[PDB]
Amino acid sequence: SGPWSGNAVHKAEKYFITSAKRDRDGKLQIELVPASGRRKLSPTPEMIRRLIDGEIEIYILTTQPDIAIDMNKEIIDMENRYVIDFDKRGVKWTMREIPVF
Amino acid sequence: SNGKLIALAVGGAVLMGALFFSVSFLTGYIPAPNHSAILTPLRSFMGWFLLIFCASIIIMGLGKMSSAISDKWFLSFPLSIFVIVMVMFLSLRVYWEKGRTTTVDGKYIRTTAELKEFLNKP
Amino acid sequence: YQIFDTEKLDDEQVVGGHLALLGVLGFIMGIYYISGIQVFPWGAPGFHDNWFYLTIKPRMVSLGIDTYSTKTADLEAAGARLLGWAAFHFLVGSVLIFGGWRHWTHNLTNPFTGRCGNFRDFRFLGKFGDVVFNGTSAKSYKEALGPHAVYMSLLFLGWGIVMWAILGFAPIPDFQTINSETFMSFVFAVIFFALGIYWWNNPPNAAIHLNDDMKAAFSVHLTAIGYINIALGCIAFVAFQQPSFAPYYKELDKLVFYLYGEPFNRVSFNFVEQGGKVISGAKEFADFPAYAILPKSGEAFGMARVVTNLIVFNHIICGVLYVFAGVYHGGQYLLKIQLNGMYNQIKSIWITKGRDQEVQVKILGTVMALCFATMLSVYAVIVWNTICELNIFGTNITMSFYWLKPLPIFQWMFADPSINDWVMAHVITAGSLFSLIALVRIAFFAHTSPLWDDLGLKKNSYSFPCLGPVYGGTCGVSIQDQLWFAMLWGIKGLSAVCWYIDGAWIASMMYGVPAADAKAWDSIAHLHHHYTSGIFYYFWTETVTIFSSSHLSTILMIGHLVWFISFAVWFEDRGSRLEGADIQTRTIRWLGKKFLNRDVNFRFPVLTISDSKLAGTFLYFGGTFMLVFLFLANGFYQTNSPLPPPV
Amino acid sequence: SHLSTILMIGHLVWFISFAVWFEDRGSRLEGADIQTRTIRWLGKKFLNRDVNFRFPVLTIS
Amino acid sequence: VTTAHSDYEIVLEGGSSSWGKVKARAKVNAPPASPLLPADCDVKLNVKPLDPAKGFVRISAVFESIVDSTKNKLTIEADIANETKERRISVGEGMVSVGDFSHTFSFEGSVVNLFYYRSDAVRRNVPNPIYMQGRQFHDILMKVPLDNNDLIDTWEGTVKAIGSTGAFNDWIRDFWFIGPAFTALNEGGQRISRIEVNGLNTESGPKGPVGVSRWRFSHGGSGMVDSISRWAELFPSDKLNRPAQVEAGFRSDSQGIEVKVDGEFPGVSVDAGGGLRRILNHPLIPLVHHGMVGKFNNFNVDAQLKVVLPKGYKIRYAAPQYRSQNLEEYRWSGGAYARWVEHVCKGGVGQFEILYAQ
Amino acid sequence: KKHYFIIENLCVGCGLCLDKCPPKVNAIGYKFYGDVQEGGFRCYIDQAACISCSACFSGDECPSGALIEVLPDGEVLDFSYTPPERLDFDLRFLHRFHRE
Numbered sequence A: 001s002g003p004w005s006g007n008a009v010h011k012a013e014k015y016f017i018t019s020a021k022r023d024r025d026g027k028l029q030i031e032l033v034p035a036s037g038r039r040k041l042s043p044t045p046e047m048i049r050r051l052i053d054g055e056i057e058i059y060i061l062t063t064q065p066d067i068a069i070d071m072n073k074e075i076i077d078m079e080n081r082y083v084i085d086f087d088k089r090g091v092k093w094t095m096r097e098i099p100v101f
Numbered sequence B: 001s002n003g004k005l006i007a008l009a010v011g012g013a014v015l016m017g018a019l020f021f022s023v024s025f026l027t028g029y030i031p032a033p034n035h036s037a038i039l040t041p042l043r044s045f046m047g048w049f050l051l052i053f054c055a056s057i058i059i060m061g062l063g064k065m066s067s068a069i070s071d072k073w074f075l076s077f078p079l080s081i082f083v084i085v086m087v088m089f090l091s092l093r094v095y096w097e098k099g100r101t102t103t104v105d106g107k108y109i110r111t112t113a114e115l116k117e118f119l120n121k122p
Numbered sequence C: 001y002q003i004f005d006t007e008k009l010d011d012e013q014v015v016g017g018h019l020a021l022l023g024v025l026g027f028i029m030g031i032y033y034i035s036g037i038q039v040f041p042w043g044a045p046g047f048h049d050n051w052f053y054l055t056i057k058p059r060m061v062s063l064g065i066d067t068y069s070t071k072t073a074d075l076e077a078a079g080a081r082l083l084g085w086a087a088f089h090f091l092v093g094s095v096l097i098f099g100g101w102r103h104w105t106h107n108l109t110n111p112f113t114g115r116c117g118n119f120r121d122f123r124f125l126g127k128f129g130d131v132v133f134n135g136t137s138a139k140s141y142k143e144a145l146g147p148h149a150v151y152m153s154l155l156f157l158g159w160g161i162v163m164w165a166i167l168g169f170a171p172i173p174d175f176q177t178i179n180s181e182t183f184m185s186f187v188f189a190v191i192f193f194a195l196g197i198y199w200w201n202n203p204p205n206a207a208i209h210l211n212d213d214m215k216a217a218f219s220v221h222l223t224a225i226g227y228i229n230i231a232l233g234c235i236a237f238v239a240f241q242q243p244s245f246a247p248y249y250k251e252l253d254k255l256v257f258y259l260y261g262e263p264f265n266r267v268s269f270n271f272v273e274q275g276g277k278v279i280s281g282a283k284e285f286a287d288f289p290a291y292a293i294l295p296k297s298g299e300a301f302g303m304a305r306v307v308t309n310l311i312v313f314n315h316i317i318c319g320v321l322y323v324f325a326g327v328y329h330g331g332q333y334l335l336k337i338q339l340n341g342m343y344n345q346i347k348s349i350w351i352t353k354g355r356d357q358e359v360q361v362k363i364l365g366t367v368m369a370l371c372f373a374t375m376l377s378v379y380a381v382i383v384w385n386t387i388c389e390l391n392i393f394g395t396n397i398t399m400s401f402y403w404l405k406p407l408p409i410f411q412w413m414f415a416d417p418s419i420n421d422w423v424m425a426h427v428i429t430a431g432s433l434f435s436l437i438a439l440v441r442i443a444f445f446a447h448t449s450p451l452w453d454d455l456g457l458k459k460n461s462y463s464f465p466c467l468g469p470v471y472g473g474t475c476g477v478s479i480q481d482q483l484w485f486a487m488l489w490g491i492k493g494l495s496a497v498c499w500y501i502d503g504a505w506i507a508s509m510m511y512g513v514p515a516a517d518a519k520a521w522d523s524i525a526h527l528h529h530h531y532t533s534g535i536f537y538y539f540w541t542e543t544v545t546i547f548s549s550s551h552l553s554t555i556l557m558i559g560h561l562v563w564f565i566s567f568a569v570w571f572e573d574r575g576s577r578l579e580g581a582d583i584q585t586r587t588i589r590w591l592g593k594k595f596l597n598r599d600v601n602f603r604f605p606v607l608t609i610s611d612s613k614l615a616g617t618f619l620y621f622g623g624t625f626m627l628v629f630l631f632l633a634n635g636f637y638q639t640n641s642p643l644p645p646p647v
Numbered sequence D: 001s002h003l004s005t006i007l008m009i010g011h012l013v014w015f016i017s018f019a020v021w022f023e024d025r026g027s028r029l030e031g032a033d034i035q036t037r038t039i040r041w042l043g044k045k046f047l048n049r050d051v052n053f054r055f056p057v058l059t060i061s
Numbered sequence E: 001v002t003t004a005h006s007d008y009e010i011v012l013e014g015g016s017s018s019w020g021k022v023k024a025r026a027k028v029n030a031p032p033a034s035p036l037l038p039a040d041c042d043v044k045l046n047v048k049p050l051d052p053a054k055g056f057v058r059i060s061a062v063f064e065s066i067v068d069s070t071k072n073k074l075t076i077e078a079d080i081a082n083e084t085k086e087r088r089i090s091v092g093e094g095m096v097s098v099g100d101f102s103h104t105f106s107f108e109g110s111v112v113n114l115f116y117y118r119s120d121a122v123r124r125n126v127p128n129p130i131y132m133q134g135r136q137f138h139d140i141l142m143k144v145p146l147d148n149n150d151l152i153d154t155w156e157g158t159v160k161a162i163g164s165t166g167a168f169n170d171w172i173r174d175f176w177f178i179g180p181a182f183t184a185l186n187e188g189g190q191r192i193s194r195i196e197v198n199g200l201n202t203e204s205g206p207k208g209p210v211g212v213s214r215w216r217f218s219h220g221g222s223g224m225v226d227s228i229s230r231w232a233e234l235f236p237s238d239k240l241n242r243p244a245q246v247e248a249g250f251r252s253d254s255q256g257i258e259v260k261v262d263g264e265f266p267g268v269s270v271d272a273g274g275g276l277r278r279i280l281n282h283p284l285i286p287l288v289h290h291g292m293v294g295k296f297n298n299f300n301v302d303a304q305l306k307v308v309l310p311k312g313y314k315i316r317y318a319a320p321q322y323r324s325q326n327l328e329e330y331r332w333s334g335g336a337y338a339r340w341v342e343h344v345c346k347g348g349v350g351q352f353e354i355l356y357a358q
Numbered sequence F: 001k002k003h004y005f006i007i008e009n010l011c012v013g014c015g016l017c018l019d020k021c022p023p024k025v026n027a028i029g030y031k032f033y034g035d036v037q038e039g040g041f042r043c044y045i046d047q048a049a050c051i052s053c054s055a056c057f058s059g060d061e062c063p064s065g066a067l068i069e070v071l072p073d074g075e076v077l078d079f080s081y082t083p084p085e086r087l088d089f090d091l092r093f094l095h096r097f098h099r100e
Ligand code: BCL
Pocket: C001, C002, C003, C004, C005, C006, C222, C321, C322, C324, C325, C328, C332, C480, C614
């Protein structure tokens, strides 16, 4: 009844930020995709509401075509913690395959 | 507030005692050649609790011993055991076994020869 | 160990497997029947007594197939009857295995006509299916329940006919004779006929099954049949001790049983087996041929209660194992449907009502709290009784719970109501609760546990030994591991059962001990039956007679070896064993090459942690209960003469 | 009597060794979570307004 | 023997939520260094996101303290926002009250904090830039209604002094750092520039005369000043998506000191690097300013820190190693942690690096 | 194409995916930070060594969801098939079976 819907390891359905392109120059190219991998969605205001409510969990991979660093709102005071907007928070999944043998 | 914790624990112990007493009255048993039916169930419940409580406090105290142990216990840990052991030995003489167990007369049976001479009373 | 999985097999394959196993079992029954032939039909002496036939001799003599009569005459007749029934079982088992092969291979072609019948569509027995079924179960186990009830009704009817005519027990209402078993055989026909008709016309529904459920239905029915076995064990214990069964179970004590492995007439070292053989040396007991298995009276051995205990504990162990296996296989099905996502799509209480993790946690917490309470109560009672009887801390037996008999409203269940029966009941409840902790963990926490849903982990493989030392250790968290822990926990309830039925005083660990007031229980508690010694001294008293038997001693040593071998796999040693086996491989390689030019190219295999746990639990259970068999097969050794006060 | 006490206590200790030596740390951890949750729920329900404490479990080492 | 019994607790939140329940009790038998005792105080700090679009958070601070025989109270309530990455704007009100005196105030000050070097060669080389040298300017416009007579008298005195004393701008410095403050300031690396009084005005309000003072000063930090170096880390207005609270207090007599603290606030956790989190770098101004009081008595510590990580998080490094672990709660008790507590209580600025990750 | 990866943030170092990797490929390896019980050990796929055989991910063996698959167009898959999302409620009947 909530742990048995979707993946049982994510209490909040997880959405990886797979593709984003600077060519369109609007950053609407940010194409969120759930871990299920069946809906190439976009960062709409409803997605913003879901993210702030905690229903969803947007995440970023390190090994990818770069999404947008400092072009999609970024906080670099600490280690980078990308944000769609300062109130939003895209927690970056770290992926150390190249640094280690 | 931990007052309710102790209240619940003591209430549970008291209820265990009362239930033991009530069922002892319910369970039809010949009390004993001498002992009563008012005190014996309470003696059994005392043993029951004292056992559970002693085990619980031993577990808890040893857990907090492992938690609080440090180098500062250098003299606190060993000497304490010393004293307790000392106390234990003294408790053997003054409380548990008060004497050397000589005969009623006091002949101090102390060799196997006199034990053989004794066990074969005429 | 997964070759005959439910998924790998279809319904017809299962039908054929069960049929072939029924045939194999009929062959086993014929083997036991022949093993029971004390005197051959040709006149010569026959087989000795085996537990395999001493377990069924009461029932066989109940049916007149065997006889407790002791003259060579009519024992030859009983042997001929047993041979005939064993031959009948042999041939019928051959036919059953033929049918099983046909169903397993799906070649359901009549050898005469060649018509290939369809498992999906088939008229049953010809016109009877038309009269009753009107056409088979097109599909579905639900539509099969009624037909199976009708089949069992026909089985009941056939047994009624067989006992009425073949075994000569007419149907009579009175329940003090085998005759009622004929009467009821007809009764339960109509019932299991009528109900079948009902379940044929009005099928039942539990939609979890019926769909992809050979494992699910198997799990439910295995748990059900395990409880059936437990109930049968209780019923067997009660009834076989009733007077009506005395002609068949209590008369064992009047017989003398020559059992394989029992004490054999010994011979001096200077013994020559020629002619009379007397001149060379002296045999142990004269009047019996050398090396002959000496008689053992059933009165001393208590063979009545020995056979009753063996049957009862067989059914209890089988039932507990079946309950555990049903919960395990149901957990496998639960995990499968959780992985594929059908769990939330099931619309039945047996799955939906425990869908919430909160209710699962509350259920398991209630079970754990009750287990803690009952275990603490019983263990405090037992240890206090031991403190008193051993007079530890200055105590004495007067402070023990001798007053704590079962209440007068519950003393009907117990012949001699004492603290022993109280501890038995509460220990059984506590062991049931303990094993239920693991069973409930299998039932609910099969794919995810509250710790694991918080820790962000999911149980997928249903056999994964662990997820590593993450979070301090994830050992033994699969449903298979919980099944193993459930078995190792039910070991204790099952022991309590054995020790209760073998006459032990389980209310204290040291009853009958020659120390302090341990022998005063009979006076203070006013017991009628002198219970066999207590939990720790029961080992000693029973081993007085286990040690007197070469066969039981061999079992003791072998089961003990098997038991302690289990730690090599259950202990957290797998990595050490793997490293050592790499060293073993290298040692074999270079040592062989130096000693012999031939190269090895072979590695010593090391069990995985999953297989390690599997084998370890198998060995633990095997040793423990192969030794419980010694406890139950030494003899009852519980006399009805209470021991006076020690002073 | 005293040797009997030692017998019983030594066997108790020895078999309690199996709770930790056996490959069961994950089971005990998953169950201690249930113990914690049961303590909180029961201490809130019939004991009133009290919830805390975690049941520790020994690591594999 | 002068024992010091302390108990600290830091419950965290998962994800990128830097929120933390910080509880802390302390009891020290050493006398406090206040020349007036007993000294009791209770401080509340409640901040709520008022207008997140413009980054405005309404922060209210209430101080209530009895010193000797006089009760004192300072309440403030200000909407503070990040105008830029280097400039912060505050519009607020408040009041002070000491015994038979009290006066309210309204202020519209602005704080511009800017470092001296923003080199990338340092940011890419040092992963933990503790010291950051900088200057923090304050342009403070504050208005006070002169309802009471003493307010008017002090306004007149200030008007006379500013318009006559050519060294007011620097002597005010040692005025408004009363007592040991002017010492501790210099002991924290903080410098204060000579203020500029842009104007004194008796711009009367609707209910009496109002003294309006606009003045600009600047405090400079050699890196040890957390109010400068950790500027962006002081103000988690971005993190503030719900009310944040702090309730602290201390009771001090010649017998000793007692301290209570209970807060729920963000900024406790910061990303060290590569998905690794860290309990924030310890501010150094509190430590160095405590060293001015903590070096006066020889004490033995009985301290116990309890870091309760979120469900599924593990500590990958702890400089003083943790004493015990309860599968989500890590306990520091005795050993090197006690040495570190004795080190910071006496003014130490040693590193206590807790790195944790999922 | 498939380009299977591991999220080092979520790996618990169980190694259930390592055993599936072909023996010679052995792309998946163990990286140790320290104090194994504290979770330092983790899993990494050397993308150079990986041959996109899908043995690691198709096994459905990752308990944490770290083992992910990036499709050729690009989409992260934490599992071969996640269960559908559901709006759940406890059906308690009114009169007969589970009242209230
Ligand atoms: C031990 C505790 C549990 C138990 C735990 C498990 C576990 C754990 C597993 C199964 C598995 C299976 N179990 Mg089970 N299961 C129990 C009771 C049962 C009973 C029953 C007696 O009613 C049945 C019908 C089943 C049925 C089944 C199948 C659905 C499945 C595959 C078995 C097979 O193909 O194995 C092939 C091997 C067998 C035939 C059994 C081994 C016996 C040998 C072959 C017998 C003859 C030789 C000799 C007499 C005895 C053996 C020792 C000798 C030294 C050679 N279980 C017991 C009580 N079961 C497996 C499965 O895949 O689950 C999905 C699995 O992993």
